[PDB]
Amino acid sequence: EHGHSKMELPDYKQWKIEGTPLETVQEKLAARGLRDPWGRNEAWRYSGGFANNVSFVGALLKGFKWGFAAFVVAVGAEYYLESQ
Amino acid sequence: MLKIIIPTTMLLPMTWMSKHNMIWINATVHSLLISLISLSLLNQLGENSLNFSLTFFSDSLSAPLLVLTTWLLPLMLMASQSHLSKETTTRKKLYITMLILLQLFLIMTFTATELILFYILFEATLVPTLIIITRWGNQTERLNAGLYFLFYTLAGSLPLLVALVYIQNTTGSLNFLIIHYWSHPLSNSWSNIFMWLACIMAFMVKMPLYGLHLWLPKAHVEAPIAGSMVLAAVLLKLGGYGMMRITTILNPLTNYMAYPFLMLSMWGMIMTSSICLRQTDLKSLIAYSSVSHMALVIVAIMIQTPWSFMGATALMIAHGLTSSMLFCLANTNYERVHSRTMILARGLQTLLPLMATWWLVASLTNLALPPSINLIGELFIITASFSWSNITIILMGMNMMITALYSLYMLITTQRGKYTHHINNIKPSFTRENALMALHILPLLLLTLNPKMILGPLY
């Protein structure tokens, strides 16, 4: 059992520089009179699920909210139990 | 002791009256049976010795050597069975006769209650080895190698006979028991110095000492596989046995006298281990490794402490077995490649996996991996040298490291990497060769369970 599903490639017109830092690269390059011939080749790195990034502090705080909620529930239960 | 000697003598008429295609089968079976018979001698006492008669005695220094000498013959026959295939029956019978005579001479040499009998047999072992080297040898330099091997030995040993007859004229007996009980100090005199030199140099040349080690690479490279086996396994240990036997008379002169030899061996082990790193030949590399090990044995004997003697005995046995195995492996490679150079045939682990496993085990046991008896002797000698002087360890340390290096180097050049594209005549390893390696290696790992059986009389 291997991956034989006949995968088909997407359409090459989908990849556009717009909305990516390569657009800024194009602006900076045309400010000097130059143009990148491979701009659309690397657009897929900014198109799909890779478009939304996370910060370092957000990366460290992966499960802070759920843990905090569990913590407050547990401390409330302990405070209501020991006070008896 | 005749229960071992007479069957060895009967091996000759049995071989010469054998059917033309049954010599190897008959010889191997009866050699193994004689080896089994030799096992009885191992049960030694903490008392004096096993004095069978006026002519022969046994000792726990002599018993392991006798057992190894008996065990070596079936292995030599199995190794020689291959390259003697296109040979006439008469010459194969002559080869087997020479091997049997060598075993008989060694057996009588190791018991030898008297020193002149010991010398006679010690030099009688020389003729069969010379004939084997110079007759069934491949290259044209076998004649020069035989000349070197003969003349180094005789130049070393001719003063020994004069020293022995002089010692008997003065003392009155050459018997080992009488000599040990009646030993008297030797005054520090010029005549006594030369007597010490004459008594020691004959056994020093056969170890061999670093200064006098030239004959050995020639003899090992040019001899057939059986010749290389018998030279590396037993013939080198004759010098150590002779030194351990003759050193008793030498004291207290040995302390002053020992320094030139101690320095030569401690530097020559480093020199030869370093030579092993840059070698283009398997046989020469194994020969130089043997030289390094026997230099360490020389150091152990010269220090002359109980731990030194036990370490020397254990190291001699372990080196004999390991070097015989290494030469057998190199010969198995040579019989396929016909070049006998490491860099030509490469990546043999991919083609011959079990033979690569045998190579790994042999290189590990040459590397002195614990708890093998190789490292037992290594460590006993190192501790004795440290007690002798706390600086020796540094040299010893270097030696160990260098040893490991070239061992794994020999394991990496020939077994690992990419196989040479052109060689296509590498056939699967035969059952005979695998049995040879197994019979070489199993006794070592059995002996490491009972080290006291090879630790000598000072245990």
């Binding site: - | 903490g46 008392e47 004096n48 009488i178 040990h180 009980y181 009646w182 030993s183 050193t247 008793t248 004291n251 002359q304 402490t305 109980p306 030194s308 003697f309 000072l458």
Partner: protein, 175 residues
């Protein structure tokens, strides 16, 4: 156990404390050791009993060899080989016995060091002094003989030491 003598290898009474459960929680150690007993110790014990009754059905004994005392090297003529042989054998046997004595003392020392644990430096001074004394004695007799040691060499060493001691005593008295 009766297999070995208690006086040769002394042991303290081995006082052990009592279990004092301060809580009602069932500890796992007791239940674990009980199930270990039930699953391991009983079958081993019954196998041992079967082997012991099998051994008792056949019984034989072996006797420790005893040796007479023979004149030593000091009661031997300068060239009389028979008495020198007997004395050398006796001296070698005595050397083996002394080696075993030192082994026994070292075993005592190691056992003390392990048994008293953290206070081994104080509670094993007796064994340390015992080993120091026996080591001093053993070293004097055989330390420098080396390989090819013999009774004559040991006697010569003892004579050299005792002339040194006699000279030292005479000089101290005549100081």
């Amino acid at each position: 156990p009766d297999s070995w003598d208690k006086d040769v290898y002394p042991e303290p009474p081995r006082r052990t404390p009592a279990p004092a459960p301060q809580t009602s929680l069932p500890n796992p150690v007791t239940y674990l050791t009980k199930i270990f007993d039930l699953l391991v110790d009983r079958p081993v014990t019954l196998a041992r009993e079967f082997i012991e009754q099998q051994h008792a059905k056949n019984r034989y004994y072996y006797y420790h060899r005893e040796f007479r005392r023979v004149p030593d090297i000091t009661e031997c003529e300068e060239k009389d080989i028979l008495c020198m042989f007997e004395a050398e054998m006796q001296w070698r046997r005595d050397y083996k016995v002394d080696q075993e004595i030192v082994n026994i003392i070292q075993e005592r020392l190691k056992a003390c060091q392990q048994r008293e644990g953290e206070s081994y430096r104080q509670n094993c001074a007796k064994e340390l002094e015992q080993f120091t004394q026996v080591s001093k004695a053993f070293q004097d007799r055989y330390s420098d003989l080396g390989a090819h040691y013999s009774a004559r060499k040991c006697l010569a060493k003892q004579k050299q030491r005792m002339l040194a001691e006699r000279k030292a005593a005479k000089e101290a008295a005549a100081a």
